[PDB]
Amino acid sequence: PRYLKGWLEDVVQLSLRRPSVHASRQRPIISLNERILEFNKRNITAIIAVYERKSPSGLDVERDPIEYAKYMEPYAVGLSITTEEKYFNGSYEMLRKIASSVSIPILMSDFIVKESQIDDAYNLGADTVLLIVKILTERELESLLEYARGYGMEPLILINDENDLDIALRIGARFIGIMSRDFETGEINKENQRKLISMIPSNVVKVPKLDFFEPNEIEELRKLGVNAFLISSSLMRNPEKIKELIE
């Protein structure tokens, strides 16, 4: 990985030590990026619903992992499940149980720094994985991208700034996610996100991450050629809102 400090260094050190899981895939592979293109062709808004394990406050808005996934299955283009344990309270067992319960694409969201983590994703039933440019060297990103494609996965490559985007385009990323929060400060900056979006070539499948939204904001981004949306907070607090993004 790159030279890091703070909690990002801490989670990288944890991920380097993550034991590989002993599981056997009993699930087809459903390409998430290609399903997004199918939704685009049918003019159906493509929402990747982000599941969060625990609520950040005492408000009892926690969702059962299976009920949430089953609720989203008829509407979402895919699901994002976070398997990081220390800060996000995820687990491999939670991913496995969700994947055996639904038949739509599952994105494994974690801090992937070694090949065995992609093995884990495949063996547990995930259809693709998240790769984060900021924590990897250019050559590590290239290697892990080729490695995931050897499983038939097109990973979602997550960028935060102009340097990230430059690397991603040069290595031939076809599936790019754009953060709305700054990586170093945690502050939401929709303005910087829209700037990066507008620089991505049209033939790349591009996916901004959004916590909250207004319906008009979605249409404006779709107008720029955004292909799909990663949405978290608004759907955890009100899962039924996904029905308002489709109809």
Homologous superfamily assigned to 33-246: Aldolase class I (3.20.20.70)
What does the block give as tokens for 6? 């703070």
Report how this structure was experimentally obtained: X-ray
Resolution in A: 1.8
Residue 189, phi-psi category: left (phi > 0), alpha (psi -120 to 50), beta (remainder) = beta
State the sign of the Cα–Cα–Cα–Cα dihedral 20, 109, 99, 95.
positive
Helices (H), ranges, the chain: 7-16, 32-42, 65-72, 92-99, 115-124, 138-149, 162-170, 190-199, 215-223, 233-237, 242-246
Residue in this structure with the two tokens 């949306």, named with its chain if needed? 229
**Cα(80)–Cα(36) distance, rounded to whole angstroms?**
14
Domain boundaries, the chain: 33-246
Nearest Cα to Cα of residue 51 among 89, 11, 8? 89
